[PDB]
Amino acid sequence: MYVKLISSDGHEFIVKREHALTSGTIKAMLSGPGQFAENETNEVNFREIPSHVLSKVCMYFTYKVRYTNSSTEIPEFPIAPEIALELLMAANFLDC
């Protein structure tokens, strides 16, 4: 129920599996030979995405999962001006 989203710098963002399957690309990575990791958590390697971008991606995962189908007003995801360019390419690549 937990997946270890290893970044390019070696950071290991252990996020819940339901959270990470928000993105289509991580769902595809965890389908097929990528789900053969028997050691509890499925380690997903992200040799292109840096730690400061993958951290914000994981925060988006736990934000969208929590704020899904909620009748209350939903705040926008806070994306820093200096990180928006790098997060944009990671949002396309991850299909999240």
Binding site: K4, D9, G10, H11, E12, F13, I14, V15, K16, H19, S55, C58, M59, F61, T62, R66
Partner: peptide
């Protein structure tokens, strides 16, 4: 409902409590 990041060196746990 509180959301945290446990940050044991390079690991990061996005758990909810």
């Amino acid at each position: 409902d509180v959301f945290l990041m446990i940050r044991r060196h390079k690991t990061t746990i996005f758990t909810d409590a």
